[PDB]
């Protein structure tokens, strides 16, 4: 409940929507939330990069972060044991970190058989008859840290034979099939040539009289001379101007009205809220559709009931609010269209279900 309340507070419009849907008894919180409902890998640089921030005013900013401590614990389980065995009783956390900095711990400055069993690589293991310490310690602890990081990354003759097969096989002298494709060859390619364009009454011309007309025009334009006066006339020019004149046939319509001032911004915002609510309700309705299981029938019936309740409890007050101002905008018409479309869809599907059963 507390988490849900916080999440609703994070989205006040949804919180307002949740209120308008639940308090108005349109939908239950169970049905409301029925449809409503990061790990970081281990980096090896978490030690060298992370340093005690020595701000000039003698400031030892540790910048203690949970992720850094978790990375330390994953890489060094011993640090987790030290933390669990000391705090909060034996010592404080910051004192433990300071001790870690001062200690030498911070200031430190085979499954596969063939190519791993170095002890077994030789078949003649006879007897011995036929700052070095600092360097060895540094190497050992570096290898330990690397192994710990690699392990934290995750968090038999058959194996030997498989490893040998992987090692010996050459990609050149194998197979190169790579034919994971399916060829396609349609039946009638003429569908696209005249595609979604509907059938047009492309009438053909008459009999050889078409050829006679072609010959007539061919002879007519065979002896052609350019003309200038005949190109245009003032009367034709006047007609063209009138067609192009404001308010003319070519100038379709004209000026329009400022819709913004015709509706208050509060009414516009409430319309947005109702749009989002109805849109989500119908989205869930269409998600349930088509009803392929008997459970979906009850869910869609509940969806329709919720739509009816929301309409009655919000749009009708919204309709009255608009009507009191006598707004000429039919914003409610869009909502009515959507609601009636959904209701008719459900009624038609119920009719189909009744017909199938009978």
């Amino acid at each position: 409940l507390e988490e849900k309340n916080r999440m609703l507070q994070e989205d006040p419009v949804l919180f307002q929507l949740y209120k308008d849907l639940v308090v108005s008894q349109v939908i239950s919180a169970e049905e409301f939330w029925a449809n409503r409902l990061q790990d970081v890998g281990i980096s090896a640089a978490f030690l060298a990069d992370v340093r005690p921030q020595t701000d000039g005013c003698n400031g030892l900013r540790y910048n203690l972060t949970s992720d850094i401590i978790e990375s330390i614990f994953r890489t060094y389980p011993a640090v987790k044991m030290k933390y669990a065995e000391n705090v909060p009783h034996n010592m404080t956390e910051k004192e433990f970190w300071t001790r870690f900095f001062q200690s030498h711990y911070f200031h430190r400055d085979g499954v596969k058989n063939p190519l791993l069993d170095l002890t077994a690589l030789e078949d003649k293991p006879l007897d011995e008859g036929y700052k070095e310490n600092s360097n060895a310690a540094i190497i050992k602890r570096f290898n330990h840290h690397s192994a710990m990081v690699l392990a934290a990354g995750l968090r038999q003759p058959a194996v030997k034979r498989a490893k040998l097969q992987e090692s010996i096989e050459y990609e050149d002298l194998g197979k190169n099939n790579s034919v994971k494709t399916i060829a396609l060859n349609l039946k009638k390619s003429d569908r696209y040539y005249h595609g979604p364009t509907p059938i047009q009454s492309l009438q053909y011309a008459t009999s050889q009289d078409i050829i006679n007309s072609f010959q007539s025009i061919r002879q007519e334009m065979e002896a052609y001379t350019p003309k200038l006066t005949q190109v245009l006339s003032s009367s034709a020019a006047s007609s063209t101007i009138t067609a192009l004149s404001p308010g003319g046939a070519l100038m379709q319509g004209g000026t329009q009205q400022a819709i913004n001032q015709m509706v208050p911004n509060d009414i516009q915002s409430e319309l947005k809220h109702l749009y989002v609510a109805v849109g989500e309700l119908l989205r869930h309705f269409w998600s349930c559709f088509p009803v392929n299981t008997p459970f979906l029938e009850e869910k869609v019936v509940k969806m329709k009931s919720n739509l009816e309740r929301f309409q009655v409890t919000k749009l009708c007050p919204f309709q009255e609010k608009i009507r009191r101002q006598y707004l000429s905008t039919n914003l409610v018409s869009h909502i009515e269209e959507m609601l009636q479309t959904a209701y008719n869809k459900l009624h038609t599907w119920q009719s189909r279900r009744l017909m199938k059963k009978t």
Binding site: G110, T119, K124, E128, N135, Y170
Partner: protein, 760 residues
């Protein structure tokens, strides 16, 4: 894919073949035609193993007589597993192509540590402990007693193989180590003894260098090897080091104390058993006087303490009666140990030849060379005749006996160095004796003189003439196969100048310089901020790397690098290094930048392979010259100079460049695998040093990238990454760097392939 290689059909298991692979096949066939040792250099990541296996299988199929059995020598167990998998794929392709399962047998050989199934021996962490436990549970004399008394210690794993595993050989095919273990569990047998039994029948046997190069372990395989057997060495650029380590002996004061304690325990046991049964000593004396051939040849199961180090001539000669008696020989060993301990009392380092030490011992302890020659024989016979189970505690005595036998017979090419003080900490009393061998060729000489042919391949083979000198032989064919790439996958750059124009160097005089360390830190920081996740840095020594890391931490530059990418630093601990590698790979595959820091001589550079997304950047901090304070290295250099006209500085440069190439050469696994190579040292600009680089790498080293700066290197890295990150199609490689069935058949392409390789 079927290929025609000089009239020989090759069943390539893959649809396409690199031209370099075809050249490698042709040259390998030509080497096989001469039945002689040959050295070939092939770039890594080119699938040379597949080509080699295909050609060997083709040779065996065409003429089993010419190549009776294939021997494969490797470096690490995972290499053996990968070779087994590749050969299994090749065999499957052969069977599918031919429609029937070929009568081919492939086997992978390893130690008892990788071939034991006994539950008691499984928790053991050490191979020597494993061997001791197995021998205690698989002793030949103990076997009969267990047959007479079930509650007595035994290992049914070996018993069932002896009863049932010998009769029926394994079916033709290829088995992995895990497969061998599973089969042994199914049959209740031990895969070790079964594998050794089946070596004589296997067409291909794969194992490591030490299993055959070490004379102590030579007879465990070579006994079932004929003259026509063909051996293969892969990535054996450090074979000389392996041979020297096998033939080198180390002795310490604690070793002397343990030897004295075990010798006293042995004397007590001898007295006790003489009281219980004196006839055992008389029977042992009868065995010695009548001949050593009776005891050794009639018990092949007692190969736990085999010492085939001595030549076959020494085997015929019997132990002198002065030490044939068990008590006389125990006193002889006590005198020898006391003389050695007294000789170790010198407060300074003493360098000596084996003949001089033998002469001194003869003057002091009246010990002639002949009685000391058969020390190993008497040691083994005495150990066998006393029913000793926990031989691990008696290992120092065996080591001392082997050292004495080596000194008694092997003189030239060996040096005795006595350092009573540690090189690192001379204040600490560490009296150490080193019997160091400077002739690796002696380890490989029987291989050359016994097997039909020897094949050596490696990705880092810059000098083709030092190996015939190092190994003291004349290879039949010395051919290098250059790498041809339609798309540049490697970007080698040399940065000898830092941001402050500091001359970047890794000389130990300048290794302690703060400016060099800070410039290295800046370079690593910029590379991490620019180059993708996969970053590997090879230093010159552990101490230098640790000091540099400490300096970076104190300066704080390392902190920014950690902020950009995760860092993983290897230590001397094996488990810690394994965890570091696992975390590095996981971070690289998880999209978080991971940086690895290792040494050129460390385990990472030895047996770790980097995929395309792992080998994005490999940075070598200077030429890895080995710390010269080891007089063993100095003595080896002196011996090489006095026996092969090789300058010590030249050999040091060669070794450092070989280690650098090994560290760098493992970052590319194919044409689509592209990586970045960085060499942060001005000394790399030297023609002698730069000229000691692999041909496939040195050729691509543009002189415009010679001695760049940190910012110039960063810009070049950005350009290379953007160029090579663009999508690429294998079709572009067709006819240029990749050959199809039709493209290989082109005679012009064949001429181009012939021109690719160069014989020196």
């Amino acid at each position: 894919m079927k290929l025609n290689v000089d009239g020989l059909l090759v069943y390539f298991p893959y649809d396409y073949i690199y031209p370099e692979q075809f050249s490698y096949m042709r040259e390998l066939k030509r080497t096989l035609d001469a039945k002689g040792h040959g050295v070939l250099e092939m770039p890594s990541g080119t699938g040379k193993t597949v080509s080699l296996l295909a050609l060997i299988m083709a040779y065996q199929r065409a003429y089993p007589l010419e190549v009776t059995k294939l021997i494969y020598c490797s470096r690490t167990v995972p290499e053996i597993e990968k070779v087994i998998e590749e050969l299994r794929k090749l065999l499957n392709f052969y069977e599918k192509q031919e429609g029937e399962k070929l009568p081919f047998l492939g086997l992978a050989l390893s130690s008892r540590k990788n071939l034991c199934i006994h539950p008691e021996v499984t928790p053991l962490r050490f191979g020597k402990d494993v061997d001791g436990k197995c021998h205690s549970l698989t002793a030949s004399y103990v076997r009969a007693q267990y047959q007479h008394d079930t509650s007595l210690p035994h290992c049914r794993f070996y018993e069932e193989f002896d009863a049932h595993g010998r009769e029926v050989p394994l079916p033709a095919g290829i088995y992995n180590l895990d497969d061998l273990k599973a089969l042994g569990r199914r049959q209740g047998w031990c895969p070790y003894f079964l594998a050794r039994y089946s070596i004589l029948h296997a067409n291909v046997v794969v194992y490591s260098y030490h299993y055959l190069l070490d004379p102590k372990i030579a007879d465990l395989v070579s006994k079932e090897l004929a003259r026509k057997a063909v051996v293969v060495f892969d990535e054996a650029h450090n074979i000389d080091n392996v041979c020297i380590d096998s033939m080198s002996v180390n002795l310490t004061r604690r070793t002397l104390d343990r030897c004295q304690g075990n010798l006293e325990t042995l004397q007590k046991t001898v007295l006790r058993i003489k009281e219980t049964d004196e006839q055992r000593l008389r029977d042992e004396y009868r065995r010695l006087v009548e001949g050593l051939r009776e005891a050794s040849a009639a018990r092949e199961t007692d190969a736990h303490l085999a010492n085939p180090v001595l030549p076959d001539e020494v085997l015929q000669e019997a132990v002198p009666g002065s030490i044939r008696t068990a008590e006389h020989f125990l006193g002889f060993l006590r005198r020898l140990l006391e003389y050695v301990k007294w000789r170790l009392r010198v407060q300074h380092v003493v360098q000596e030849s084996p003949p001089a030490f033998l002469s001194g011992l003869a003057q002091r302890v009246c010990i002639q060379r002949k009685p000391l020659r058969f020390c190993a024989e008497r040691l083994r016979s005495l150990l066998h005749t006393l029913e000793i189970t926990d031989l691990a505690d008696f290992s120092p005595l065996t080591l001392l006996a082997n050292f004495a036998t080596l000194v008694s017979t092997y003189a030239k090419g060996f040096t005795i160095i006595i350092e009573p003080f540690d090189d690192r900490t001379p204040t600490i009393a560490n009296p150490i004796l080193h019997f160091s061998c400077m002739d690796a060729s002696l380890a490989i000489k029987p291989v050359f003189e016994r097997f039909q042919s020897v094949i050596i391949t490696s990705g880092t083979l810059s000098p083709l003439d030092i190996y015939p000198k190092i190994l003291d032989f004349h290879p039949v064919t010395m051919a290098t196969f250059t790498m041809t790439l339609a798309r540049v996958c490697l970007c080698p750059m040399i940065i000898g100048r830092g941001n402050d124009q500091v001359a970047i160097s890794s000389k130990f005089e300048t290794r302690e310089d703060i400016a060099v360390i800070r410039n290295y830190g800046n370079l690593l920081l910029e590379m991490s901020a620019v180059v993708p996740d996969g970053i590997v840095a090879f230093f010159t020594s552990y101490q230098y790397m640790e000091s540099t890391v400490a300096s970076w931490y104190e300066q704080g530059i390392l902190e920014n690098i950690q902020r950009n990418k995760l860092l993983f630093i290897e230590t001397q601990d094996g488990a810690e290094t394994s965890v570091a590698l696992e975390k590095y790979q996981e971070a690289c595959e998880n999209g978080r930048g991971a940086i690895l820091l290792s040494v050129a001589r460390g385990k990472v550079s030895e047996g770790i392979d980097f995929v395309h997304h792992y080998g994005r950047a490999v940075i070598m901090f200077g030429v890895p010259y080995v710390y010269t304070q080891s007089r063993i290295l100095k003595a080896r250099l002196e011996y090489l100079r006095d026996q092969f006209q090789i300058r010590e500085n030249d050999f040091l440069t060669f070794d450092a460049m070989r280690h650098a190439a090994q560290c760098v050469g493992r970052a590319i696994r194919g044409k689509t695998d592209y990586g970045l190579m960085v060499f942060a040292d001005k000394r790399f600009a030297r023609g002698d040093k730069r000229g000691k680089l692999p041909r496939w790498i040195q050729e691509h080293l543009t002189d415009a990238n010679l001695n760049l700066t940190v910012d110039e290197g960063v810009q070049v890295a950005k350009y290379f990454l953007r160029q090579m990150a663009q999508p690429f199609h294998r079709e572009d490689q067709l006819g240029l760097s990749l050959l199809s069935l039709e493209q290989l058949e082109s005679e012009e392409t064949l001429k181009r392939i012939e021109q690719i390789a160069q014989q020196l």
